[PDB]
Design a protein around this ligand. Structure first.
Ligand SMILES: Cc1cc(CCCOc2c(Cl)cc(C3=NCCO3)cc2Cl)on1
Lengths: 255, 40, 236, 273, 236, 59, 40
C-alpha cells in the first residue's frame, strides 16, 4: 500500500509528511555524503553539529497569484539566519552541505496551475544593465526573502526576466537541471535532495552560493469560479551532512 | 609512442565509451519501472 | 643522418588533427581531481533528457506563454496544433535537442514527443496525436491524420503521454538544417472526443509539450551552429 | 547492437506510454512500445559526440597585433603596439565559448597554435623576416614595460620564438587552481559590497605577451597574431541550458537590453505546418 | 628515403623544451667530481630552514632594527604586532621563504612562524599568538584574536616558540602574488599577562621572529621574480 | 473538513526554556511535523520526553 | 634513444627525488628529539 504518493522525511527533530508527492529527485543521482580524506585539503578537523543543523527550516511563505513571475532563493544564503546553522556559517572560515528541499502548494480538484521547481548549480546571474555591469553582493544575497522575479529592476541588482533564467538561457531548457513540477491536478509538493557540488572540496559559505532553488509558475494559476484568486507556496529546506571548518572570529558581511 | 615526457603533451584522449544518461534522465529516488503506473 | 622526403601538406595547420606537442611547463603538477556529481561523457547522454518546446510560437516577443498549448472545452473533431518535423528549425530550434542537433550535420533515430496535461483534476479529455511520414501533406482533418502513426491519449491520473516518432526513412540519415529530400513528416493533434470542464470552472486549460531523443539516435559530422555569432571580440 | 527489436500487436494492462512528467524523469520509451517494429541494428557508436571530440579541435581564441617600427621617441611601447599582450581568457570569442558553457566545470590540457602573418600596408621595398617572441608572464611576474626590457630575458618564464608566417605550437597542462575550471561562478572574491561578481575574479591566470625580436627596417610592418586553442584530455561536469541571447562581456552572463525575440514566430497559426 | 610530413611548430625555439644536441667538444673529458659538503637537490629542501623576518618594517631605511619586535614591561591586554599573510609581499618578501615563493606562481602548505625571546633571564612574560583564517578581519583585540588558531606562549628556559599556520583553505592552491580570493588570513600577537623585568633592569626587550615552510608545502608553475631587474647589460 | 478541501498545518513542540512561540518562524525551530491533510485523516505528533530532571510534578 | 655519442649531448636529467633537508635544518652535533626539552 506504499504509494509513490505518500512520504515521510524525518531529519533531526523535524518531520514532514506529504500525502500527494510525485516521487523525489536526487540530483545527478547522488545523495549528500561527508568529505572524504582522499579529497581533503585543509588540515583542520571539521565540526559536524549533526542534528542541531540538519533539521528542516521553513522559510516565510510566498503568494502565487495570476500575475506571479517566479521566485529565486540561493543556498546557503536562504538559511544564513536559521538557528545554529546560521551561527556556524558566520563563525567558520569554510563549511560544506547538501540539502533536502521540500516545496509545498495545495489547492483543490477544481484549480489548475503548474510550477517548475528546479535546482541550478552555480547560477551566475546577469546584470539588467548589459555590458559588464556587475550584480552587487546584497542583490545576490536576498536571505530568506529570496528574489522576486516580478519585482522591479533595481540598480546593481540582477535582471528578473523569466524566459531567460536570469542569465541568457531559455526557460524551456531548465529541465536539463534536477527538477520536479507541482501540477495542482497531480502533485502538491516537490522534493529534491542536493548533494554538495563544487570544484573545491569545501568553500566559503558567504562569498559563494552553490545552488539557486527556483520556483516558477509555468501554467498560470486558475482558480474555480469566485474562488480567491491566489494560493500560498511554502519552501522548507534542511541542511544535510553539514560540516564546518576553520573556526574563528565571525564574519562581517556587507549590508 | 610518446616522444615527450609530460602527460599534457600527449594527443587527444580516446572515447569514453562510458555513456550513462540515467543520472540526467532518471534521478528519481524510488525507481520507476516502464509499464508500471507512474503514481501508485 | 637518416634520409627523408617531405610530402604535400608539410607545415599545414589543420584545426582537427591530433598530435603530440612539447609541454611549456615541464614538470608541473596539476591539482588533484576531487569527485563532482554530474559528469557528462557524450552529448548523446544529454539529448535524452526532455525539455519543453515553445510550440505556441504565435507571440510577438519571447514569452512564457509560447510554451503553453491551449485547449478549448466542448470543441469536437477539431485540431489542437500542427508543426513539421525540421528538428533544426522552427519550434524545435531552441530546445536542448534542437540546440545540439545544430552542432552536427546529419541525424538519424527516433524522437520522443510527450504532452503533460495541466487542467483541473475533475475535467477529462481524449486527444489523438498523429505522426505523418514524409510523402503526404500535413493532415487537414483527423480522418486524414488518423491513417498514419497515432496514439489516442486518455487524460487521466497519469498526467503525461509519450508519443514516439519512429524513424521512418528511405535514406539512413537526414540533414539537421531543413532539406526537402531529407524531410521527416508532420506532427498534428486533434480532439478525439473533447475537453470537458467540471462545474464552477472555466476557460482554457493548457498542455505542456516536451522533446527528447530515443536511445536509437545518431548525430554525425560536427559543424558550427547558426545559433551564435558576434561582431567584435568581447572584453572584460 | 539492436536499434529496434521486432515487436507485434499489444492489448495489455501494462502501458509504458502513460507517465507522470511531474516526477522529473524522462522515461525511456521506444518506438516498439507504441507501434509494431522489425529488427534493425545501430551500425553506430556515438564516437563523434564524445566530449573529448566535441571540445578537441582547435578554435580561434584571440587575434591581436603588434608592429615593428622605430621606437625612437615612443613614450609608451605598449601603446604603440611595439608589443601587446592578452590577459589570457577563453571568453573573448563566442564560438568556442558557447560550446564550453554547455557545462559548469571543465578540466583539460590546452594545446595552443599561434599563427602570425605580416602586412605592409604602405610602400615597402620588401617583406622583412621577423621573429616573434611569445612569453607568458605568470601573475606576480615583472610585466614588460618596453620591447627590449630585461623581462624579455624570460629566464624562468616559458617563451617561444618563431618566424612570422610560420606557426608555433605547444601544450600546457591544466593550470587551474581548483580541481576544474569554473565555467560559472555565483560568488565573489570576498564579502565586499562593491567587489565584482562572476568568474572574471576566479580566472586570473596572468597574460601572454608578444613582440618582434628584430629591430626596425626602413618601412613599418604590421604583424597580426592569432591564437588557437584545442582542449585535450577533457572532463566536463553538470550540463546546463545552452546560451540563447548574445554575449556582452568576458566572464559575465549579461545579455544586451532590447535584444530580439530568440524564438522564431510562426508565419500562421499554432495549427500551421 | 622515408616519407615524412612536418607539423605546425617546426623550427620553433621553446626555452622550456628538453632535447638532445650535438656536442661541440667531441670526446672531451670533464674534471673528476670530488666530494663537497652541502649538495642541494630541491628548493623544497632549503625553504624549511628558518630565517628572520623584518617584522618591524616601520623604519625608513633598511636597518638591523626592523628585525627586532619590541616588548614593553607592564602593559596588559595590548597588541604586540600584526601582519597579513601574503608570503610573497610585505614583511615576508625578503625572507628566504618569501624570496623563493616568488619564483613560483602557486603555493599550498603549512608555514612555521616562531619567536625567540631575548630579554634578561630574570624577567618573565606570557604572550598569545593568533592565526585568523581567511574570511574575518585582522583581529582588533585579544578577545577577537583568541577565537581562532592561537598558542599561549610562556617565556621560559626554552627560548623559542614555534607556531604553525595550518593550511586552512577551500581552494587547494593560493597565488604567491597577493590575491583576494586566494588570501590566507592574518597573524597577530598580544600580551596574555604581561612582560615583567627584574629589578635593576630597564627598557624594551625584543623578540626575534623566523619563518620557514612545513614539510607539507608545495610550490608550482615557475616564473620570473619581481625581485630583480636591470637596465643595461653588466660588463667586467 | 469536506473531502474536496486541502490544507497543510505545522504542529510544533517547544521544549522548556523558551517562550510559547510567537510566529511560525519561531515555532518551526523546535520539534515539529508538517501535516498534509489527505486520505489519512489523523496525524499523530509525539512530544518526546525532553528533560534534565527525570520526573516532573503533575501539579 | 641517444642519437649522439657524448654525454653532454643528452637531454635534461630526471628528478633527484633525493631530498634531505637535515644537512640544512638540523646540523646539530647532539641529536635533538622533538618533544624532549631543547636544553637539558
Ligand atoms: C580557461 C583557461 C585556460 C587558460 C590557459 C592558461 C595559460 O596557459 C599558458 C601557459 Cl601556462 C603558457 C603559455 C606559453 N609559454 C610559452 C609560450 O606560451 C601560454 C599559455 Cl596560454 O587560461 N584560461
Amino acid at each position: 500500500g506504499y504509494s509513490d504518493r505518500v512520504q515521510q522525511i524525518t531529519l533531526g527533530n523535524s518531520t514532514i509528511t506529504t500525502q500527494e508527492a510525485a516521487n523525489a529527485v536526487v540530483c545527478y543521482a547522488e545523495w549528500p555524503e561527508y568529505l572524504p580524506d582522499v579529497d581533503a585539503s585543509d588540515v583542520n578537523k571539521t565540526s559536524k553539529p549533526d542534528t542541531s543543523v540538519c533539521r528542516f527550516y521553513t522559510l516565510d511563505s510566498k503568494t502565487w497569484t495570476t500575475g506571479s513571475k517566479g521566485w529565486c532563493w540561493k543556498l546557503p544564503d536562504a538559511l544564513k539566519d536559521m538557528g545554529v546553522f546560521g551561527q556556524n556559517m558566520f563563525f567558520h572560515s569554510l563549511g560544506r552541505s547538501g540539502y533536502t528541499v521540500h516545496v509545498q502548494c495545495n489547492a483543490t480538484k477544481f484549480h489548475s496551475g503548474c510550477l517548475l521547481v528546479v535546482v541550478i548549480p552555480e547560477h551566475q546571474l546577469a546584470s539588467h544593465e548589459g555590458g559588464n555591469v556587475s550584480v552587487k553582493y546584497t542583490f545576490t544575497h536576498p536571505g530568506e526573502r529570496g528574489i522576486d522575479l516580478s519585482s522591479a529592476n533595481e540598480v546593481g541588482g540582477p535582471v528578473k526576466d523569466v524566459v531567460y533564467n536570469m542569465n541568457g538561457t531559455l526557460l524551456g531548457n531548465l529541465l536539463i537541471f534536477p527538477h520536479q513540477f507541482i501540477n495542482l491536478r497531480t502533485n502538491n509538493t516537490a522534493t529534491i535532495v542536493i548533494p554538495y557540488i563544487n570544484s573545491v572540496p569545501i568553500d566559503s559559505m558567504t562569498r559563494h552560493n552553490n545552488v539557486s532553488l527556483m520556483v516558477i509558475p509555468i501554467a498560470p494559476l486558475t482558480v474555480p469560479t469566485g474562488a480567491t484568486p491566489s494560493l500560498p507556496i511554502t519552501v522548507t529546506i534542511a541542511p544535510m551532512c553539514t560540516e564546518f571548518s576553520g573556526i574563528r572570529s565571525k564574519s562581517i558581511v556587507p549590508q | 609512442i610518446n616522444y615527450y615526457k609530460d602527460a599534457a603533451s600527449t594527443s587527444s584522449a580516446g572515447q569514453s565509451l562510458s555513456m550513462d544518461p540515467s543520472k540526467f534522465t532518471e534521478p528519481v529516488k524510488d525507481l520507476m519501472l516502464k509499464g508500471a503506473p507512474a503514481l501508485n | 643522418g637518416l634520409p627523408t622526403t617531405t610530402l604535400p601538406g608539410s607545415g599545414q595547420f589543420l584545426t582537427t588533427d591530433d598530435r603530440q606537442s612539447p609541454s611549456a611547463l615541464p614538470n608541473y603538477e596539476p591539482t588533484p581531481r576531487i569527485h563532482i556529481p554530474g559528469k557528462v561523457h557524450n552529448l548523446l547522454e544529454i539529448i535524452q533528457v526532455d525539455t519543453l518546446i515553445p510550440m505556441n510560437n504565435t507571440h510577438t516577443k519571447d514569452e512564457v506563454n509560447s510554451y503553453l498549448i491551449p485547449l478549448n472545452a466542448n470543441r469536437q473533431n477539431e485540431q489542437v496544433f500542427g508543426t513539421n518535423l525540421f528538428i533544426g528549425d522552427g519550434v524545435f530550434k531552441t530546445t536542448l535537442l534542437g540546440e545540439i542537433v545544430q552542432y552536427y550535420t546529419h541525424w538519424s533515430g527516433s524522437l520522443r514527443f510527450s504532452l503533460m496535461y495541466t487542467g483541473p483534476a475533475l475535467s477529462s479529455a481524449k486527444l489523438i496525436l498523429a505522426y505523418t511520414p514524409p510523402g503526404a501533406r500535413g493532415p487537414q482533418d483527423r480522418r486524414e491524420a488518423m491513417l498514419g502513426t497515432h496514439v489516442v491519449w486518455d487524460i487521466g491520473l497519469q498526467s503525461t503521454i509519450v508519443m514516439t516518432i519512429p524513424w521512418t526513412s528511405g535514406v539512413q540519415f537526414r540533414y539537421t538544417d531543413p532539406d526537402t529530400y531529407t524531410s521527416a513528416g508532420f506532427l498534428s493533434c486533434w480532439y478525439q472526443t473533447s475537453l470537458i470542464l467540471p462545474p464552477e470552472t472555466t476557460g482554457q486549460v493548457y498542455l505542456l509539450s516536451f522533446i527528447s531523443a530515443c536511445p536509437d539516435f545518431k548525430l554525425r559530422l560536427m559543424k558550427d551552429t547558426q545559433t551564435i555569432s558576434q561582431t567584435v571580440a568581447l572584453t572584460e | 547492437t539492436v536499434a529496434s527489436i521486432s515487436s507485434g500487436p499489444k492489448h495489455t494492462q501494462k502501458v509504458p506510454i502513460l507517465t507522470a512528467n511531474e516526477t522529473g524523469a524522462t522515461m525511456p520509451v521506444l518506438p516498439s512500445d507504441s507501434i509494431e517494429t522489425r529488427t534493425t541494428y545501430m551500425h553506430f557508436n556515438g564516437s563523434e559526440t564524445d566530449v573529448e571530440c566535441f571540445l578537441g579541435r582547435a578554435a580561434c581564441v584571440h587575434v591581436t597585433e603588434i608592429q615593428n617600427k622605430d621606437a625612437t621617441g615612443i613614450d609608451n611601447h605598449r601603446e604603440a603596439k611595439l608589443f601587446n599582450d592578452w590577459k589570457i581568457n577563453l571568453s573573448s570569442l563566442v564560438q568556442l565559448r558557447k560550446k564550453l558553457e554547455l557545462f559548469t566545470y571543465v578540466r583539460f590540457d590546452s594545446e595552443y597554435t599561434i599563427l602570425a602573418t605580416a602586412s605592409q600596408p604602405d610602400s615597402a621595398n620588401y617583406s622583412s623576416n621577423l621573429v616573434v617572441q611569445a612569453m607568458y608572464v605568470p601573475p606576480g611576474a615583472p610585466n614588460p614595460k618596453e620591447w627590449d626590457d630585461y623581462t624579455w630575458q624570460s629566464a624562468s618564464n616559458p617563451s617561444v620564438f618563431f618566424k612570422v608566417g610560420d606557426t608555433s605550437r605547444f601544450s600546457v597542462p591544466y593550470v587551474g587552481l581548483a580541481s576544474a575550471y569554473n565555467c560559472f561562478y555565483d560568488g565573489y572574491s570576498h564579502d565586499d559590497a562593491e567587489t565584482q561578481y562572476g568568474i572574471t575574479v576566479l580566472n586570473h591566470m596572468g597574460s601572454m605577451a608578444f613582440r618582434i625580436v628584430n629591430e626596425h627596417d626602413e618601412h613599418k610592418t604590421l604583424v597580426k597574431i592569432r591564437v588557437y586553442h584545442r582542449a585535450k584530455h577533457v572532463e566536463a561536469w553538470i550540463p546546463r541550458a545552452p546560451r540563447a541571447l548574445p554575449y556582452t562581456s568576458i566572464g559575465r552572463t549579461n545579455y544586451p537590453k532590447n535584444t530580439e525575440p530568440v524564438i522564431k514566430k510562426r508565419k500562421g497559426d499554432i495549427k500551421s505546418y
